[PDB]
Design an enzyme around this catalytic site. Structure first.
Site, PDB file in Angstrom:
ATOM      1  N   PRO B  88       2.664   6.181  10.885  1.00 15.46           N
ATOM      2  CA  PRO B  88       1.497   5.661  10.164  1.00 15.46           C
ATOM      3  C   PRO B  88       1.397   6.297   8.776  1.00 15.46           C
ATOM      4  O   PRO B  88       1.645   7.479   8.609  1.00 15.46           O
ATOM      5  CB  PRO B  88       0.303   6.018  11.066  1.00 15.46           C
ATOM      6  CG  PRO B  88       0.840   6.874  12.169  1.00 15.46           C
ATOM      7  CD  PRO B  88       2.306   7.100  11.985  1.00 15.46           C
ATOM      8  N   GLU B 121      18.676   0.392 -13.426  1.00 17.91           N
ATOM      9  CA  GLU B 121      17.855   0.152 -12.271  1.00 17.91           C
ATOM     10  C   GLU B 121      18.630   0.488 -10.945  1.00 17.91           C
ATOM     11  O   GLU B 121      18.018   0.808  -9.932  1.00 17.91           O
ATOM     12  CB  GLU B 121      17.549  -1.355 -12.343  1.00 17.91           C
ATOM     13  CG  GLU B 121      16.376  -1.896 -11.576  1.00 17.91           C
ATOM     14  CD  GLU B 121      16.461  -3.446 -11.376  1.00 17.91           C
ATOM     15  OE1 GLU B 121      16.251  -3.909 -10.228  1.00 17.91           O
ATOM     16  OE2 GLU B 121      16.755  -4.186 -12.362  1.00 17.91           O
TER      17      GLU B 121
END
Lengths: 157, 157
Positions: B88, B121
């Protein structure tokens, strides 16, 4: 469009004697004929592995560790992950992704649940018999991939 | 409360010579500074493994096979599953469950993408250098568990 659910499903196995031979058994739970409203249940009457929905604030592992205890009171049991079942359509209730684990536990806790007050609903099956049951969802696929992985672990010893 | 997403994330590796020694390299993609609206991007500027969202009508495997081709034109490459990343909080954008795979491909397709028109990138990093990058989401955890599994496969030979 997002998923409708994440589940932690457990192949819960033991080894015990059938006709004086050590045989892999699995715990399975028959789905009720009815839903909560008393109408026909999705996959009603079909056998399913133990498991449940994972909560937003836990991992599938945490949910499996919990579901192991709720169903058997076992606590110090490592759960072995063996796949993800995500095939579209696997669950008719929606887009539900299953994280699947197996465990090998001593036979006595599994016999207790199969013999307790839910007895008609819970069985401890030799795995070859379990494979022929009417099984919920894709659980036949789950059992065949678990059986195969567990067998191949037992073969390595 | 249901999950916000399911992703298929790919540890894309090759072996090539660094200082005349065969070294495991990984392809990674730096997240843009901005989102589509031109405001600051979640995890902007951080390096991420290739991957994408799985569609309601495919498996995470199908999505990984596709994302491999879109990013490298490779087509006959088995993708090895190595975990689920479901902790989580892993993704700030919501409750997102990642199915993670690795692949070992020839160096040339990865060098092409790192050297092409997205060059600033995209990088092809030795894995020890990749582990020190600023990495998006839990991708550091993904790379450490992949490195470990890949190494242990290479050790067995």
């Amino acid at each position: 469009r997002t998923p409708d659910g994440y589940t932690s499903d457990m192949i819960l196995t033991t080894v015990k004697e059938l006709n004086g031979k050590p045989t892999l058994h699995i715990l399975l739970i028959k789905r009720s004929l009815t839903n909560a409203e008393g109408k026909p249940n999705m996959e009603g009457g079909k056998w399913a592995v133990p498991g449940g929905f994972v909560d937003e604030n836990e991992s599938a592992e945490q949910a499996a560790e919990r579901e192991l205890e709720e169903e058997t009171s076992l606590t110090d049991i490592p759960l072995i992950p063996f796949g993800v079942f995500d095939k579209p359509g696997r669950d008719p209730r929606g887009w539900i992704i299953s994280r699947a684990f197996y465990a090998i536990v001593p036979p006595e806790a599994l016999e207790k649940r199969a013999a307790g007050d839910d007895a008609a609903e819970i069985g401890l099956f030799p795995m070859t018999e379990a494979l022929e049951l009417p099984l919920a969802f894709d659980h036949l696929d789950m059992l065949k991939k678990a059986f195969s992985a567990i067998t191949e672990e037992f073969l390595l010893t």
